Design an enzyme around this catalytic site. Structure first.
Site, short mmCIF file in Angstrom:
data_model
loop_
_atom_site.label_atom_id
_atom_site.label_comp_id
_atom_site.label_asym_id
_atom_site.label_seq_id
_atom_site.Cartn_x
_atom_site.Cartn_y
_atom_site.Cartn_z
N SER A 1 0.86 -1.21 0.00
CA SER A 1 0.00 0.00 0.00
C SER A 1 0.89 1.25 0.00
O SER A 1 1.58 1.48 -0.99
CB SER A 1 -0.97 -0.18 1.20
OG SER A 1 -1.94 0.88 1.08
N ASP B 1 -10.05 -3.47 -5.04
CA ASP B 1 -9.38 -2.66 -4.01
C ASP B 1 -9.82 -1.19 -4.10
O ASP B 1 -9.61 -0.56 -5.13
CB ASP B 1 -7.85 -2.83 -4.24
CG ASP B 1 -7.01 -2.18 -3.14
OD1 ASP B 1 -7.49 -1.21 -2.48
OD2 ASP B 1 -5.80 -2.51 -3.02
N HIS C 1 -8.32 -4.92 -1.00
CA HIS C 1 -7.01 -4.45 -0.57
C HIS C 1 -6.22 -5.45 0.32
O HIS C 1 -5.05 -5.21 0.59
CB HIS C 1 -7.21 -3.09 0.24
CG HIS C 1 -5.93 -2.34 0.49
ND1 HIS C 1 -5.13 -1.85 -0.54
CD2 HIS C 1 -5.30 -2.01 1.66
CE1 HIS C 1 -4.10 -1.20 -0.01
NE2 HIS C 1 -4.17 -1.30 1.32
#
Ligand SMILES: [Cl-]
Ligand SMILES: [Cl-]
Ligand SMILES: [Cl-]
Ligand SMILES: [Cl-]
Ligand code: NA
Ligand code: NA
Lengths: 721, 4
Positions: free
Chosen positions: A568, A653, A688
């Site tokens: 991320s 995501d 995610h």
């Protein structure tokens, strides 16, 4: 044999600065600047375009073909992960009303079972146990199933609400069931929510939060049971896209806190829950002031305990305001300190507990209320929970602290090689009782590993802490293979805490290291707010490079033996360091990675963009354009040699859009001058966080470890060499 | 904790 797919290019000009009809912030460059983005077409907000899906499928085929030779090593590591978890398991139970609540996992089942027993019975006693929600039944027939919250309705806790997301885009439906009548179908459905559930004062109504079409939480509502959702009443709307809406219930259940927060600024309102199911009138605490953050934890209904950075309190101060004049901030309970960073606070009936950091490590502090009047007094001061070990991580577990008068709080403790323990702790004398100790099988032993703290030196001479763990039998007389992890954004500190994810590396004779780079808050809040954000953000990347250089210069490893990973905003770290210093790494993992920094951050139609104008800056503005461009991973891909890379991402995501790693992998392959492999694993069935199904999650994890161990030539466990 |  397998050849990577060649991505098509389509001309596309991206505008950074003023765009008539769009909110590009209060001061966008005019005339605007333009940038060419020939892979812009990879973006489809509907995740259905045939050419986009075909291209992603060709990436998946290439990933499966290049991974075929590590199938056995992936199977070995997956078996290790399975041996390091418990087929049959139970969380640390806690009291709420007439029950002890907990979850179970059961052998061969991928999801949790939410359970309870009466407080006079043993958690997990089958003759006493009541199943509330079996997520395995909820997930029947579904490829992906995230049940986020399960909340029984007061006072009876018979009616239960639960929130479920079946795609991974973190938009959840709230559904209901009655525990005492499991075949009564409750018709109410609340759609479009952020998955949080807060009951009203009784079982007749609840509160929930919805998202706008850019998935920003912007509204708080009340649903009355037995009504259509179209009859729900909106209690609060946050129109400014920098800010998201939030809500939570005070610990004594008498007040709902509702408000707005952006990275720089907070605003809180109180809703009294003592005045019936039609009282919707909010009480402002303090009107928003840019740059002022605060959090409110009610002490009963009379006093607000406020944690804030106001008036220069970088590491935060604690104050107590009266309910009747909640902007009167004159009564300081705990003033700001240069060494103690107060991160969060739980207030209960006769004590408070503060989670934060001091001397580089998480700490807990407690304070009793005055025993004569029940009021918090500044002369009492915080009492630190003293911990014996030089390296550890401790968390306050507020999700297992439901009863406002409970005389203990719930703390969880671990270290890099020490499995988590959950304790009930007295805030009066810091005595404790272990409630759960995580069991880790497959031969695991904490005493097999050495844990150390080392320090790299950044260019500006700041000492960058590293937390290091490795197997006690590893020959330290020569350089060894090593995995270096970083994250470095949002003031989220990386901690030396237990994870089974590094065991396959340490058990194969690798060092596992965390670089505590600026952008975390490890050394206090300034480590983030000044250390790495806006026009200092580049410190995240150069601190990580200094950590890698340290491990090489100390002869702990060599570039040919060094891997790096991050996910991320840690994938932004991976993309920047891969452009800057690919010569330091043999192999890299970039999970769900934020890499398309200019094209994503100029564009407020992409989830999270507008709020992150207060993290990195707004590239529609002269102040940020060059600086963000200087590290944006997509825009600094160049003709040089890159390491082997594996990129994991999720089609659904809602935090890092799938098209950022797709465009980035395409550009890397187009420009790179080495013959290393870059593999893009796009999960079409999650968001995610990969799979909530624990076996799928561990299999997804194992492919990543198998790829690193293959490229590090450290595939065989130490025990069986 | 709305992060990447
Ligand atoms: Cl296809
Ligand atoms: Cl679950
Ligand atoms: Cl609730
Ligand atoms: Cl008080
Ligand atoms: Na097991
Ligand atoms: Na969904």
């Amino acid at each position: 044999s397998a050849q990577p797919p060649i991505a098509a290019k389509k001309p596309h000009r991206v505008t950074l600065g003023y765009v008539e009809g769009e909110d590009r912030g209060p001061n966008p460059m005019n005339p605007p600047r333009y940038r060419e983005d020939p892979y812009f077409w990879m973006r489809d907000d509907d995740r259905k375009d045939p050419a986009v899906i075909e291209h992603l499928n060709k990436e998946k085929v290439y990933f499966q073909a290049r991974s075929a030779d590590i199938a056995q090593l992936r199977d070995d590591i997956y078996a290790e992960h399975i041996s390091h978890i418990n087929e049959d398991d139970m969380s640390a139970p806690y009291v709420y009303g007439k029950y002890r609540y907990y979850t179970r996992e059961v052998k061969g089942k991928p999801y949790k079972i939410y359970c309870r027993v009466f407080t006079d019975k043993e958690p997990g006693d089958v003759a006493a146990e009541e199943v509330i929600i079996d997520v395995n039944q909820v997930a029947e027939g579904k490829a992906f199933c995230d049940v986020m919250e399960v909340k029984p309705a007061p006072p009876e806790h018979d009616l239960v609400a639960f929130s479920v997301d079946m795609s991974g885009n973190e938009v959840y439906t709230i559904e209901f069931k009655r525990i005492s009548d499991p075949s009564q179908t409750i018709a109410d459905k609340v759609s479009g929510t952020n998955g949080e559930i807060v009951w009203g004062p009784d079982h007749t109504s609840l509160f929930y939060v919805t998202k706008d079409e850019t998935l920003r939480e912007n509204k708080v509502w009340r649903h009355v049971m037995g009504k259509l959702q179209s009859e729900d009443v909106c209690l609060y709307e946050e129109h400014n896209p920098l800010f998201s809406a939030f809500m939570y219930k005070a610990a004594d259940t008498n007040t709902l806190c509702i408000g707005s927060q952006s990275p720089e600024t907070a605003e809180v309102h109180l809703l009294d829950l003592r005045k019936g199911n039609a009282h919707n009138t909010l009480e402002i605490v303090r009107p928003r002031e840019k740059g002022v953050r605060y959090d409110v934890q009610m002490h009963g209904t009379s006093h607000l305990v406020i944690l804030t950075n106001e008036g220069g309190a970088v590491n935060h101060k604690l104050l107590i305001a009266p309910r009747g004049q909640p902007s009167d901030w004159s009564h300081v309970l705990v003033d700001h300190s240069e060494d103690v960073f107060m991160e969060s606070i739980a207030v209960r009936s006769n004590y408070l507990v503060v989670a934060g950091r001091r001397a580089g490590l998480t700490r807990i502090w407690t304070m009793m209320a005055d025993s004569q009047d029940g009021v918090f007094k500044a002369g009492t001061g915080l009492r630190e929970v003293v911990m014996e070990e030089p390296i550890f991580t401790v968390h306050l577990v507020e999700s297992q602290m439901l009863e406002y008068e409970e005389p203990t709080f719930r703390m969880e403790y671990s270290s890099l090689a020490t499995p988590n323990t959950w304790f009930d702790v007295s805030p009066q004398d810091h005595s404790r009782t272990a409630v759960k100790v995580r069991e880790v099988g497959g031969g695991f032993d904490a005493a097999n590993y050495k844990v150390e703290r080392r320090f790299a030196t950044a260019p500006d001479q700041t000492k960058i802490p590293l937390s290091v763990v490795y197997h006690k039998d590893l020959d330290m007389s020569q350089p060894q293979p090593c995995m270096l992890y970083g994250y470095g954004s949002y003031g989220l500190s990386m901690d030396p805490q237990f994870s089974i994810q590094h065991l396959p590396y340490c058990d194969r004779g690798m060092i596992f290291a965390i670089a505590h780079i600026r952008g975390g808050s490890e050394l206090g809040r300034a480590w983030y707010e000044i250390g790495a954000k806006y026009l200092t953000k580049r410190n995240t990347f150069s601190d990580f490079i200094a950590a890698a250089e340290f491990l090489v210069n100390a002869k702990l490893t060599t570039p040919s033996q060094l891997a790096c990973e991050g996910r991320s905003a840690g994938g932004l770290l991976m993309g920047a360091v891969l452009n800057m210093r690919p010569d330091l790494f043999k192999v890299a993992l970039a999970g769900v990675p934020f890499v398309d920094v200019m094209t994503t951050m100029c564009d407020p139609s992409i989830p999270l963009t507008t709020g992150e104008w207060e993290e990195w800056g707004n590239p529609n503005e002269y102040k940020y354009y060059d600086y963000m461009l200087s590290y944006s991973p997509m825009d600094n891909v160049r003709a040089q040699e890159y390491p082997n890379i594996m990129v994991q991402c999720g089609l659904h995501d809602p935090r890092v859009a799938y098209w950022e790693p797709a465009k980035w992998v395409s550009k890397l392959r187009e420009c790179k001058t080495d013959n290393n492999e870059i593999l893009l694993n796009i999960d079409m069935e999650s968001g995610h966080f990969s799979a909530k199904d624990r076996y799928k999650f561990w299999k997804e994890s194992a492919i990543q470890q198998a790829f690193v161990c293959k490229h590090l030539k450290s595939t065989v466990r130490l025990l069986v060499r | 904790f709305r992060v990447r």
